[PDB]
Each structure stands twice: as C-alpha cells, then as structure tokens.
Design a protein around this nucleic acid. Structure first.
Lengths: 88, 129, 218
RNA sequence: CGUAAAGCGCACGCAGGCGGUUUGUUAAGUCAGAUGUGAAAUCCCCGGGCUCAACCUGGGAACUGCAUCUGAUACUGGCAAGCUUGAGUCUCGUAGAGGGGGGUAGAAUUCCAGGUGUAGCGGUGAAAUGCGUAGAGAUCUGGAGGAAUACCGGUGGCGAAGGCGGCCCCCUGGACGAAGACUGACGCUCAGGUGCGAAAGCGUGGGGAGCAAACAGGAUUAGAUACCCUGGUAGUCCACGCCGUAAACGAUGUCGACUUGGAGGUUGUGCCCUUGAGGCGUGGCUUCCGGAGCUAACGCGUUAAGUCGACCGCCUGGGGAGUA
RNA sequence: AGGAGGUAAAAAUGCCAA
C-alpha cells in the first residue's frame, strides 16, 4: 500500500523539508521502500505476472533516476546508495 | 516528443493556411522569431507578436491574396535526423529564384538571395515555394 | 435595423460549420444570424443586381419548398422578370439546347389549345394534350418568355435548389442565394444570410428584389 | 508497408540515434579568405598546327579532397548557471470481468439407493444401432460427485497484448479527476538482450459430472474410412514445469504537435435556480456518421489512412519456400 | 412504435486447341 503514514516518514527523512516531495532523492527512497515491500508479496504467489509488471516499472523508474543523479550530483549519489544498501 | 519546434512552426503555418484561419499561436523561441522576421520582411505574413513573459507564446498573422494562401508550400530540409549545410557557390534556389529559402549563416538568419549576395553559405533551414 | 420581424435563422443544430462567419446561439440552441453582417451584404446584393438590370439582363428566380412557390410567381411578373417556382428541372441551363425543344413544343400546344384544335379529331385525346399542357405550364413557367440563357440568378434557398447553383457555376452566371445556416455558401457569389422558411421572410427578399430591379430597368 | 510484397504477438530496456527553453564561454561540426599539394596525359573551355577530320599542341578551368593559419558564431555540438510549459512525485477521492490466493451459493446435467407406476423410451428427413417387462422412460424423496456461473449484460467496463464474468475475504498492479506543493529536461525510440504470451500439444502427480479428437456400431451413399445417429478414451479441470505459435487482426509500430462538424455511450468535476428525467462548462475513454484533405479505388476522416517531426521493424515478380 | 415462435433426404462430372 505504502500508506500516507508510511510515505510521510520517508519524505521527512530525505527531503529538503516536508514540502519537498519532488526531489530525486525523495523519489528513489519512495521506490526502494516499495520495491522491498513487495518482495514479501511476490514470494508466495510467484505466478502473478500482472502486478509484477508494476514492480518492474518501479525498478526501471528507480534506475533512470540514479543515472540522472550520478550524472548530476555525485556527492549525493554515493550518499544515497549507502543510505539504502543497493547498486551491486 | 516536440523534438523539433521549427518543423512544428511550419506545420502550424501549413495547416493554418489550409484551414483559412487568421492567426497561429505557438511557443516562442530565439530561432522561431528569427525566422518570422524573414517572412515578415518578405511579405509572406503580417507582423507578429511575442505574447508572454516566461511562457512566451509567439502569435502570427496569415495573408491570403484572392482566396488562395500566400504561402504555396513550405517544407523543412535540414531536419534533426539529417542536417544539411551548403557553401556559397552551391546554394540552392526555390522556384528558380522567385521562391525564397531562409538559410542560417554565421552572420545571421538570412534569405537565399541575401547570403548569396553577402557571399557565404550556412545551414539551409526550409524552402518557401 | 430590424427591417422586419423575421430574418433570424433555422435548423437549430444542423449547421454547416462554414457559416461560422455569421451565427448566434439561442435558448432553443438555434443558430441566429445577426443582422449587422447580412443587412450590409443584403444592401450589397441589391446594388449589384441593379448593375446588371441596366444591361437589360435576364434575371431568373428559383425556389419551391411548397410554401415559397406562390410569391416567386408573383414577384417575377411584378416587374417583368422570369422564374421557376415549381419543381426544378435538373439540367435546363447546361442543356438548354434540349429544354428548348420542349419550349418549342409548348408554344405549339399553348397556341393551338387556346384557340383551334381542342375538339377536331378525338375528344379524349384532346384531353390528353390539355393534360400534357398544364404540367408543362408550371414546369416551364416563366421561362418561355425569355429565350436564351439568363444573366443572373436569384435563389431563395441554397440547400434545396443545389442543382442550379452547381449548374449555374458550370457557366459564367453570378448567382444570388438567400442562404440558411444548414447550407454551404461556396458556389454562390453574392451570399445573402437570412431565414428562408417563413413566408413573411420571403416576401421581404422578393419584394426588395422586385422593386430594385424596377429601378434598374430605366 | 488498412486490403496489391511488407508493422515484430505484446512489453521493458543497455549500447546506438534524436531532444524543450534562457544566458555565457569555447569554436569541434559548419561557413569565409589564403597558402601547400591534388603528376602529366585524358575530359571540358578559348586558341593554334597537319588539304579538313580523327590525330597533335598552347593557356585557363577542374581535381568537387584533406591538412594548416587567421577569422566569423547564427545553428548543431562540448562546458557552466538556470527556467517551466515536457516527464516525475506527494495530498484528497472516484470507477472497473486488472492480477494472485483462500473460502462460499444456487440452478442444472449425470450417477447412486429407494417409493409410486406402466409399456415403451430415445433419436431422426425417415429409420436403425442403443435402452426397456431383470421393470425403463415419466414422477417423488434422499445422497454423492465434477464442471460452469443463467437474469443482470449493453459497438458496457478493464488490461501492454494474450485475455478477464456468481458472491465474499486477503494480498496487489494500473488508469483517471480537482485544487495546491515540489524536483528541474530527469525525455522519445530501440538492434542485440530479458519478460509476458489464446488454443492445441508435452511431462509428473491428482481430478473426471458434462463435452468430445481417436475409435466402434447404425444409417446415408455409386463408394462415404464424412456430414447425421448412438456410444465413447485421450483431452478439456487443478497444482507445478515446458512449448512459444494463431486471420496473436482496429489485417493499421511507438511518441509528440497541428487541422471543420454532428448524434450517443461511459467515468470524473465545477458553477448555476436541487428549485423536477435539469442549465452552462471543463477533463479521460469509447461507438457511429461525415467535410476539407488523402487514396489505385473502396474507404480513412481530431482515436487519420490529413499535414509534418524522431527512432525502430520489414518489403523488392510468381512458384520452388518460410522449404532444404 | 416495440416484440415472440415456426420454416430444406441425398444430388457427381463434361476432352485438347481456337
């Protein structure tokens, strides 16, 4: 679901303030909060191919933002992935 | 994906004549106003206006002689998938002279006849038949 | 200036969008034509047909619509001019070298029946010719007095009589159509916007085109 | 490249290609001038010499090229600071056969046990095979089992496509609307690559009412290894793997911009008199008709097959052959 | 203007070129 309670902690933890729901670092932390969340959902089913496509959009949405941020603001790019534990 | 607003300008011009409209309004530019000068001095249009401050909408004004369009046919040549530049002596000519060809030279956005008389080539933007 | 209490408009949604130069919506969603653009163009037309009236030009009138045929018969003989008030004959102007052959057939049977052979050989077949006559009397009405092609053509409904406007534009004939909002005003040269399904509306245009062409026949 | 040969079944996506807008810088691309060379002959030009011609010769032109230097800076590119209209996020909500999982209900068929009851039933163009006096079929009560969800239901809704229909819960994708806020071009497309992909098949293990390839019998027929009749196994069902094809078809790739209208469907939303099946708007999606235009025509026609732009796929007479 | 039910046993082929 990624409830209104759930996201409001994420935008405060990463944004320039609580009104800054638009930043690159905010959106990536929103996606990794949800990509990790549905890993529990996509274990017992494993054959729901429909809603799996919405996860692959959330993956590819995350991948395009990191490549933008790495091209832009390298100091924060190597700040986020060690704040999240991703990128291989 | 509006990846060429210059071709969008002429396609607004071309469809604007076929629909017998009065004006055609489009987002402004540095290059689009530079082309619209060359048509205005040529008499292909009436005077334009750049309406806006931060979201600038350039508007135009069409011309018709009898019922026919003043612009016969206008088509872009150096498209963003294939850009064409020519020298001074290998400049083109539209309608064997009596059609214009707005070119882009290092000295500015000039006509076919002007930059040949000024003696320099450049980027051939579009022909106006 | 309200010249009379009807010019307004008709057809209420069946509007040709090429009459967007003169429209106005209403409560019943009808397209009203405003007078401020047609009454100069109405007075444009009344001057332009007096220019050809001075040439002693033949002006022909058309339009039936079951309720306009009555005064077109009246306004044509009001000055001197010509008219087709009944059901129009498709191909009479661009094939005038074949409708003249029935005009010549009319003026035989109009002459002989009005005095002479209406009894001489067969009484039943004499009723055949006067059954032939009166249907030819209305179809070829005031055309038999003209001879040759007209010079202009005053139409009261563009949509209904669309054959003639296409027929007259095949030749060099400047036409004059009272147009309704549903028709297309392209073949007509001197377009006149206004209502044409009210009887009181038609007597304005027919009364104006008759009295003006009387002034033009000086 | 709708139907003549040709849009990958559909999607995501790396390399590749293309990119809004404002300012500055550089000057790679590009343009200008000059030098160097671009062998001569040959071609071309203006000339000359063999009686002319072919042949021979003088000068120019050319060699469309690359390299250098000085420049020019619109445009493209590189770099730096932006901006918001492109994309994206967040808040409140709406609609839905979107998906996965687990329950659950009624009608019906078949079957099983019996009650009553009596000679046919069933089927067909007609009949027969079959079934029935061991008591069928008809009827009533009861029980089991599987599969599918009447009515609603509609060119209605949803999904990238395939596809999806009782009801309920749980997990869960996506779209859309209104008023604000934020990030600042983060975009489009996509070879190879990866993923989904009807039905039928295949593998294992269950399930098996109905239906029905094969198969058998009866007819039919010249024959009928067919339609039709009576049966009837695989199969259809479920769980998990595989196959990867369809007239996988609006026979129409994806994205964006622009260009007359009209009648509806569906789902939001604002205002107004809710004052009653409203009135005027403003969005998304969808069906039919039709103008300009286009088209070989038929027809498409703001959801284009119109007018253009960016990338990708593919076609080059028919067969042989989508075969070796 | 709207709407319901009913309505065929099998039946093949015709030389080559003009």
């Amino acid at each position: 679901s990624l409830s209104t309670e759930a996201t409001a902690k994420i935008v405060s933890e990463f944004g320039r303030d609580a009104n800054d729901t638009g930043s690159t670092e905010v959106q990536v932390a929103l996606l990794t909060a949800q990509i990790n969340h549905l890993q529990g959902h996509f274990a017992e089913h494993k054959k729901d191919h429909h809603s799996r496509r919405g996860l692959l959009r959330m993956v590819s949405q995350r991948r395009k933002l990191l490549d933008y941020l790495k091209r832009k603001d390298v100091a924060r790019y190597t700040q986020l992935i060690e704040r999240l534990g991703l990128r291989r | 994906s509006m990846q060429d607003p210059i071709a969008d300008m002429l396609t607004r011009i071309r469809n604007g004549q076929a629909a017998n409209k009065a004006a055609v309004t489009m987002p402004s530019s540095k290059l689009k106003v530079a082309i619209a000068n060359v048509l205005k001095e040529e008499g292909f249009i009436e005077d334009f206006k750049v309406e806006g401050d931060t979201k600038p909408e350039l508007e135009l004004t069409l011309k018709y002689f009898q019922g026919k369009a003043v612009v016969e046919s206008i088509q872009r040549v150096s498209r963003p998938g294939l850009r064409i530049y020519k020298r001074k002596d290998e400049l083109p000519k539209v309608m064997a002279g009596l059609g214009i060809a707005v070119v882009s030279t290092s000295k500015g956005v000039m006509t076919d006849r002007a930059a040949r008389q000024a003696g320099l080539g450049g980027e051939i933007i579009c022909y106006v038949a | 200036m309200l010249k009379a209490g009807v010019h307004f408009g008709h057809q209420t949604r069946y509007w040709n969008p090429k009459m967007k130069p003169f429209i106005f919506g209403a409560r019943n969603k009808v397209h009203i034509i405003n007078l401020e653009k047609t009454v100069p163009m109405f007075n444009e037309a009344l001057a332009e047909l007096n220019k050809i009236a001075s040439r002693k030009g033949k002006i022909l009138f058309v339009g039936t619509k079951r309720a306009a045929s009555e005064a077109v018969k009246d306004a044509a003989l009001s000055c001197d001019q010509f008219f087709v008030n009944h059901r129009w004959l498709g191909g009479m102007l661009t094939n005038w070298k074949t409708v003249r052959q029935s005009i010549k057939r009319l003026k035989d049977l109009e002459t002989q029946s009005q005095d002479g052979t209406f009894d001489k050989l067969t009484k039943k077949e004499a009723l055949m010719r006067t059954r032939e006559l009166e249907k030819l009397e209305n179809s070829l009405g005031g055309i038999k007095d003209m001879g040759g092609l007209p010079d202009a053509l005053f139409v009261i409904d563009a949509d209904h009589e669309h054959i003639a406007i296409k027929e007259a534009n095949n030749l060099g004939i400047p036409v004059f159509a009272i147009v309704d909002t549903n028709s297309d005003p392209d073949g007509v040269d001197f377009v006149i916007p206004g209502n044409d399904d009210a009887i009181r509306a038609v007597t304005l245009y027919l009364g104006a085109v008759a009295a003006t062409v009387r002034e033009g026949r000086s």
